[PDB]
Write a protein that binds this ligand. Sequence first.
Ligand SMILES: [Cl-]
Length: 448
Amino acid sequence: ITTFENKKVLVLGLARSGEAAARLLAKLGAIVTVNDGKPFDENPTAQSLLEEGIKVVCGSHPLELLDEDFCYMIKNPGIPYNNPMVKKALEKQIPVLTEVELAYLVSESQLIGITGSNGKTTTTTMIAEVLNAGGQRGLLAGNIGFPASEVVQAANDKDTLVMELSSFQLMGVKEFRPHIAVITNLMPTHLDYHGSFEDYVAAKWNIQNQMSSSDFLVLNFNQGISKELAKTTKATIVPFSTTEKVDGAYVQDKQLFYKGENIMSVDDIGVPGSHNVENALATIAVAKLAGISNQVIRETLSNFGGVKHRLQSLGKVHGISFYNDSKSTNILATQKALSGFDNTKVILIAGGLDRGNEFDELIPDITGLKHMVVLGESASRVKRAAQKAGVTYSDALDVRDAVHKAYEVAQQGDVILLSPANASWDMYKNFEVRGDEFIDTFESLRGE
Ligand SMILES: [Cl-]
């Protein structure tokens, strides 16, 4: 791959994948400039990149930067397209891509891509577990696991990337071509960013733009929209349904089938609810296309217990339950995580990268908490919300320290919950590294 050798490339934003993109581009011989809104002195990632000899521009977005001879922009997916830097790149006919396109260009591995309005993380995780159990080598990538541009460097032609993809990422692909792709479902989501439902659907539909009839697109035939979209792709359609028999994965007589093969019972899926039946059906379609055996599919999905870092129940130490919800990186996710708990039992660990917002929205949901242990760049802002909600709080140096501090104030029947309502990037490369520190500390307290 010489396509980036001695080309100037602008990486707009850091966040989850921008560092990985910048590093991979540099390895490919590109001359990289990173532009990020957070001032340099508060920006550990930009500091580290400058130390590696990559140009950084922090605290501002100068449009004049795009007058330079840039051949590509890699944008943080969540930046909306009405952003002035994005608008100018488009005016200047500089291709605007996301990092998943870059990962695809350098990839020698088989690619399975998963998108959809909801069910993405469970479905992606189930797929990787089933492939691994069947003797393939599935590597989680994209919006779980590790960023795609990080994973592709370790992966080879024997590996399968199992990539969770957002509509935001799919706005920025060109050559990206999965051999198998899944759309779990489509319902109005992220319309703040996309405008209309039609534009949001069009964004995800980019997943199949380069797919041929030799490639496979797994669609949800419970929804009429899927049957309409199916008419417009070149990919071979492999539907799933819980409504009727289809030429793919379906429910029949309380069993899950794939094209007339009986795989497993509905009630034996390891996690409950119809949403999980649909995630298991999508998984069965992908696994059968990849050639995994029925017995391996059944065993794996029967024992599937959930996903790492998402309201992940670890167990107890002296009657105190620990939950790793490191995946919660905003106020809305933490509101949801707290909804299932009696707050009087909960010690919440929260704080992280400071995007500059206060936490007043969290006040009703944190009222009644036993205690809050606060860490990270945004700690003072989180503490102001705790103070207004009448919740006692204390400070911690990092997640390890917060777990120890929480445990020392906990008693039998309490819950220690890491649901930070903030991104991890001031202190940890990604939410997974952050959740692993929580796990490791729990294990140290538990013993073996
Ligand atoms: Cl992350």
